[PDB]
Every structure is written in C-alpha cells, then in structure tokens.
C-alpha cells in the first residue's frame, strides 16, 4: 500500500490531501493537485529488485507544509509460513482537525 | 475607489462548518431551468465586494 487520497472533488480547486511512502520515509501532504499520475506497471516476476517508481504527484500550487517523519509501518521476519502483520487505519474529522 | 479585496461568498448551498473555507466560484440560481451561465438573471453569481 501507499497513501491515501482526501477530498471532495479530486480535483485542483481546493486544497486535496495526499500521503506518500518511501522505503524508509513518509510524506504526507494537503495542496490543490488535479489528478494523480501512475506510473508504468506491468511486472511481476522477472523483475525482483523493486524500483523505477515514484514521481506520482501532479502539479504544484499553493501548498502547505508536510510531515516528513519515520515511517508508521514496521516488518517481522515471516518464518516458518503464515507470518504477516495487520495493519489498522481510523481517519475522521472533529472541528477540522 | 476601494482596494476591491472584499470577496464575500454571498450564498451558496451548504451552510459551512466551523473553521472551513471554500476556494471556489458558483453559478447559484435557487433552481429553475439549470444554468452555469454568467448572466445575472437567475443564474446569480456570488462573491461580490
């Protein structure tokens, strides 16, 4: 997984919050973007090293600050078959926040 | 002659939440014959100053 998009028209009109992962970072950020771009993916197996990715955003425009901090997510070692983690997300909002 | 930075959203169609603004522009009529027109007649546009 890789972030989330929140708004009303997913549209550059008004300010439309976006999050962003690294491997080791985390980007999360509100600003008015138009439409967000994917890149080329087609790879399953041949491919095992993961990377040309990234650059998805859209354009700039009048944006606020970001969040760049350690990354939420965290891995263990899947020993002996059947070990995955869970992970639980909330979003709401109370008074804007 | 002013500074013309008055821009008041007049009326729109959803009362605002606390603390929320809206960045955007309306063709907002009251509902006959629905138009997006810049007419002023039926088709009223806010944000006057």
Redesign the interface.
């Given at each position: 997984i890789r972030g989330w998009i929140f708004g009303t028209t997913l549209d550059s009109?008004?300010?439309s919050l976006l999050i962003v992962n690294n491997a080791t970072n985390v980007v999360i950020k509100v600003c008015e973007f138009q439409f967000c771009n994917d890149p080329f993916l087609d790879h399953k197996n041949n491919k095992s090293w993961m990377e040309s990715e990234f650059r998805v955003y859209s354009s700039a425009n009048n944006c606020t600050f970001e969040y760049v901090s350690q990354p939420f997510l965290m891995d263990l070692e899947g020993k002996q078959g059947n070990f995955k983690n869970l992970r639980e997300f909330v979003f709401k909002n109370i008074?804007?926040y | 002659s002013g500074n013309y930075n008055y821009l008041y959203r007049l009326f729109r169609k959803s009362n605002l939440?606390?603390?929320?603004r809206?960045?955007?522009t309306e063709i907002y009529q009251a509902g006959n014959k629905p138009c997006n027109g810049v007419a002023g007649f039926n088709c009223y546009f806010p944000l006057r100053s």
């Open positions: 009109k008004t300010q008074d804007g | 939440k606390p603390f929320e809206d960045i955007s």
